[PDB]
Symmetry: D2
């Protein structure tokens, strides 16, 4: 007795389009920046749209009506892209270059690089909106972007496996050990400049 999967299938479709739109902006920046300064800020990107089960789960946790309309108006990380950068300073270069764009707007920002989480997690999280041009309408949609270095990706990926303690203490060691190395690398890369 319902049609509830109609907006969710709809949901996934329009939010992937937002990822396609943002991915493009990112690639052109990386391309052009490299074309100007002989250096790629972006090592690579990853895109994912939240599974429906995670959406419904998340809606239930905050006690909200279970519909695509309500997920659409309450969940900002439905569409997610992860930008992995070669160097720390690249992270903030991308953030700047993306936000200054006309159709791109900043909604939420959390910088766990300056202020890592308790367990050691480091990463710049921003939510932006872009317009998505559909066959018969324009949707302005939020995309969640995680900007991190290779090192931050490495550590995050492992700590994440553990969620599915004894390792808490030892992970924090790696988190700073990685910070330490990537700054050596950053320092050396900088001295050569372009």
């Amino acid at each position: 007795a319902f049609d509830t999967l109609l907006g969710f299938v709809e949901l996934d479709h329009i939010y992937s389009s937002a990822l396609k739109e943002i991915s493009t902006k990112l690639s052109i920046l990386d391309d052009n920046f490299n074309h100007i300064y002989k250096h790629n800020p972006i090592h690579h990107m990853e895109r994912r749209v939240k599974e429906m089960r995670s959406l419904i789960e998340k809606l239930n946790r905050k006690g909200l009506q279970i519909s695509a309309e309500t997920a659409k108006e309450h969940i900002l990380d439905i569409a997610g892209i992860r930008v992995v950068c070669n160097y720390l300073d690249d992270i903030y270069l991308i953030e700047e270059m993306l936000l200054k764009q006309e159709d791109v707007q900043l909604i939420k920002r959390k910088d766990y690089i300056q202020h890592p989480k308790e367990n050691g997690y480091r990463s710049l999280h921003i939510v932006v909106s872009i317009p998505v041009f559909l066959a018969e309408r324009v949707e302005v949609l939020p995309v969640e972007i995680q900007i991190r270095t290779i090192g931050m990706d490495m550590w995050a990926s492992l700590e994440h496996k553990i969620r599915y303690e004894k390792y808490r203490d030892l992970l924090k060691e790696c988190a700073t050990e990685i910070t330490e190395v990537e700054d050596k690398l950053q320092q050396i890369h900088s001295e050569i400049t372009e």
Copy 2:
């Protein structure tokens, strides 16, 4: 003497324009399919004009050879070709794209309304989009050729012949296939319309 190759810049920013249009096109195809359960775009092809082709074009229109002047005189530096499943898709794509805020129409030539002498049929529009570079916004024209499969079939073959080009023997016979393809693709369209009701 000293590197006059500003074109590498040209090639760089105009290929970026193609990514932006291509992204737009792909989303229209995707969303229209999600709504009317049918993909208008069969596929797309993208190309940035060879520098060899540019200078030749500049030479022909009697223009100075610099990237700067090509940027403001050649609209088909960046080109994309949208091959559609059915005749009516050609005009759906045209409509869906123009209605987008950041797409601006510059030029339009409809060789479907008025096929060329040799039989060529195709819808040509030039649009502008903004390209967001690391340090500036460049607004660039992309030339878009919209056609059906048959029109594509025919075009690519005619291109091989003319582009020692004899034609001659085939001009007459190519024009026959051009019309024969039109006729059938209308049969196909007629049928497709009736069942999508």
Copy 3:
């Protein structure tokens, strides 16, 4: 009370790998053939793995045990690739170039081009096996290949929509009208040779 989705998810995984393997052989042929004769036989390819529902449905129709093992040993078109060619004669060039390969074996062949189906359908269907090299074993798997021209693809795609009559008679007209045009095209293309 079962694990029946384990082999099916397994099934889809190993059969896509077969598609990756066959796709590659095809691309190298198209690439190299064009590199030698300045002409691409392949306009494009399409790959698809049968949905589980279609597999189960098909198993039920022939009254077979419902398991991935049994689908694996009875259904040859689990993995399918559709090679669309620019010209009719290209179809048989590809067939030859693919079958002569050491790791490629012909299992089933149906040529609806010489002998179209009653409704007008034209297409060369072959089933081949390739070995698929997995982490811990080698599977030899069947892939079903449909080789057709652009014209044949066009007609097929439309006739297919109709399955989901008045149009039967009129489709057959298009089927031969398309044959007629593509042969004109074939004739003209041939006269220029390479």
Copy 4:
């Protein structure tokens, strides 16, 4: 005088070799992940040696300049770089690939067992595969560099410096990062192994 560019042939068939190996690698990654719920390959990178690099290499080994002789003397014409998530993945990939019937091992140099003077670490193997061309079968060597992310991080940076190359100031300090990366990536591996039980 007359087109000596047999290399375009060379570039053509060796890029075909990369497609065949790349396909193999991708399937191993996919299947291993399906079984042990973990991707060994983080990503891959492919490259066919620039002709500029080839002739230079031929010049250095004092060989005649022809595609024919390069074909039988240069094993790294086609090269692929497999970046892995964990140290142990490097050897899993090595093993899974060699056990394939049509992959034949030609050469092996393990700079992880024995890192170079400057700190470089990486597992180098040359394999042969058959390439099925339109009219023949060519058996070609591909050079494969297998490394962890950290080894990749470090390598790409060291490459920028040496490839006016000062090094000097950084050699010492690069070697420090090389060891610092090793140490941590073993911490990571140690932890990952314990939880995958």
